[PDB]
Design a protein around this motif. Structure first.
Motif, mmCIF file in Angstrom:
data_model
loop_
_atom_site.group_PDB
_atom_site.id
_atom_site.type_symbol
_atom_site.label_atom_id
_atom_site.label_comp_id
_atom_site.label_asym_id
_atom_site.label_seq_id
_atom_site.Cartn_x
_atom_site.Cartn_y
_atom_site.Cartn_z
ATOM 1 N N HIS A 1 -0.532 1.560 4.633
ATOM 2 C CA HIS A 1 0.165 0.568 5.651
ATOM 3 C C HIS A 1 0.582 1.425 6.772
ATOM 4 O O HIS A 1 0.855 2.437 6.741
ATOM 5 N N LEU A 2 0.639 0.742 8.084
ATOM 6 C CA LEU A 2 1.267 1.374 9.202
ATOM 7 C C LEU A 2 2.659 0.936 9.015
ATOM 8 O O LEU A 2 3.126 -0.332 8.687
ATOM 9 N N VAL A 3 3.722 1.975 9.276
ATOM 10 C CA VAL A 3 5.198 1.636 9.287
ATOM 11 C C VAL A 3 5.560 1.899 10.628
ATOM 12 O O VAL A 3 5.553 3.088 11.212
ATOM 13 N N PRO A 4 5.873 0.740 11.265
ATOM 14 C CA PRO A 4 6.367 0.842 12.676
ATOM 15 C C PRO A 4 7.760 1.226 12.748
ATOM 16 O O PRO A 4 8.593 0.529 12.998
ATOM 17 N N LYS B 1 9.492 -0.301 7.749
ATOM 18 C CA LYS B 1 8.659 -1.562 6.932
ATOM 19 C C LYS B 1 9.037 -1.647 5.508
ATOM 20 O O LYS B 1 9.606 -0.791 4.889
ATOM 21 N N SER C 1 -8.459 1.479 5.138
ATOM 22 C CA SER C 1 -8.390 2.343 6.692
ATOM 23 C C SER C 1 -8.657 1.154 7.643
ATOM 24 O O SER C 1 -7.789 1.025 8.390
ATOM 25 N N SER C 2 -10.049 0.828 7.527
ATOM 26 C CA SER C 2 -10.302 -0.254 9.066
ATOM 27 C C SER C 2 -11.686 -0.749 8.876
ATOM 28 O O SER C 2 -12.195 -1.371 9.747
ATOM 29 N N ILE D 1 -8.149 7.057 10.937
ATOM 30 C CA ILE D 1 -6.616 7.053 10.510
ATOM 31 C C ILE D 1 -5.973 8.321 10.143
ATOM 32 O O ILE D 1 -4.840 8.645 10.261
#
Lengths: 32, 146, 193, 49
Positions: free
Chosen positions: A11-14, A17, C25-26, D15
């Protein structure tokens, strides 16, 4: 249900989250 | 599965108790037939037959004269069966599947089952009242049932 | 990345495969298929129609007999022994199930045996041709339109002549006190043309 | 566990996290301590294990 493992996620955590999920039927400690 | 049979030629035994026994929720094999022949695997020596009549050959069963097995086991020594002898019995239905398309009417002859000899002549054998009581029991299961 | 997806085929169409997937990932998606089946055999075999009858109980996609005890709710009548001239009570469905099983049987006249259904009953024990009346201890006979039971067809003499009718209709005529005489548990010749 | 290599798999890094397809254990395995080695398929050695 009874898993050996789960939550296998990225996950991205901005800066904050929050995720929501069911703990499984396993009557054991889950290490996250 | 092992139990014991009733004695042969029993004088004036309760025919209505036979109806009660055949009516039981555990009861789903019940017929009169010749014992035909026996087999070897000791927990299920096969006990083949010659089907004369049926009354509650129940669960997914069909019409008579099938001559199928009715197996026996070594610990049931009080339930011995005679090749060529006419007989009467009651108990649970067969486990319905095998290597064939069905295991149908392969009887288990399990514990707490009913068993007795069926008189092949009754006029000569004193009072035919014992065989007549069995015929009245079979008529009652066929007319009134459960 | 980390976003999740859930998948189904369109309405009434049978999807084969895993239900849900997650964006890693992407680029990856897991564990989804390379090729799939959105739709399948949604219609079963219909009207297989195994060969049942009033003395019968068809099974395994084929005809069969019924048990005489399951035939026990049939109307009571006089009959005779399978190997002797002696008369006794019987029921038409039990006799028909026995004959389907290859067993012997014989006929009798309408007064030849002590059949329990031979006259009108009381409340709490009525045959399929009647029911109890409101606040009353007597049973009442139904009309022929009250035929909730399947019934055999049988031969009977009425108005001085032999005629085929339903077992429940003959039972209603018997219970209401109409002048009748049963002749066979088989139907008459009267419908021949 | 007998030191014989059994598969290779590659993925691109976007990433600093690289999630690989979920390798199924072959239908009759040697039990014991399988090993995962990883290398960049670029001008780098950088073995991890």
């Amino acid at each position: 249900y009874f898993p050996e493992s789960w939550l296998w996620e990225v996950h991205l955590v901005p800066r904050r989250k929050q995720l929501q999920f069911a703990l499984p039927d396993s009557l054991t400690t889950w290490e996250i | 599965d092992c139990g014991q049979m009733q004695e042969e030629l029993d004088l004036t035994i309760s025919a209505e108790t036979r109806k009660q026994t055949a009516c039981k929720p555990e009861i789903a094999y019940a017929y009169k037939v010749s014992i035909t022949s026996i087999t070897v695997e000791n927990v299920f020596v096969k006990y083949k037959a010659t089907l004369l009549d049926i009354y509650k050959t129940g669960e997914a069963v069909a019409e008579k004269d099938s001559e199928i097995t009715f197996i026996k086991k070594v610990t049931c020594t009080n339930a011995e069966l005679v090749k060529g002898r006419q007989y009467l019995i009651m108990g649970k239905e067969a486990l319905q599947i095998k290597y064939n398309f069905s295991f149908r009417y392969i009887y288990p002859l399990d514990s707490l089952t009913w068993i007795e000899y069926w008189p092949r002549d009754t006029t000569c054998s004193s009072c035919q009242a014992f065989l007549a009581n069995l015929d009245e029991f079979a008529e009652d299961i066929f007319l009134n049932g459960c | 990345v980390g976003e999740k997806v859930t998948v189904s085929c369109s309405g009434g169409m049978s999807l084969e495969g895993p239900s849900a997937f997650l964006c890693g990932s992407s680029l990856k998606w897991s564990p989804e298929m390379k090729n799939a089946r959105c739709v399948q055999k949604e219609n079963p075999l219909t009207q297989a129609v195994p060969k049942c009858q009033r003395w019968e109980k068809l099974q395994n996609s084929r005809c069969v007999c019924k048990m005489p005890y399951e035939c026990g709710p049939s109307l009571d009548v006089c009959a005779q022994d399978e190997r002797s001239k002696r008369i006794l009570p019987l029921t038409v469905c039990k006799m028909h199930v026995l004959h389907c099983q290859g067993r012997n049987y014989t006929l009798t006249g309408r007064d030849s045996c002590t059949l329990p259904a031979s006259a009108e009953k009381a409340c709490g024990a009525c045959p399929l041709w009647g029911k109890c009346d409101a606040e009353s201890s007597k049973c009442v006979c139904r009309e022929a339109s009250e035929c909730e039971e399947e019934g055999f067809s049988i031969c009977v003499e009425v108005n001085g002549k032999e005629q085929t009718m339903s077992e429940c209709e003959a039972g209603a005529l018997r219970c209401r006190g109409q002048s009748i005489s049963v002749t066979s548990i088989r139907p008459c010749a009267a419908e021949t043309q | 566990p007998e030191g014989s290599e059994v598969d290779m798999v590659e993925e691109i890094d976007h990433i600093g996290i690289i999630s690989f397809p979920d390798f199924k254990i072959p239908s009759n395995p040697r039990y014991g301590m399988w090993t995962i080695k990883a290398k960049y398929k670029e001008d780098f050695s950088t073995t991890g294990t």
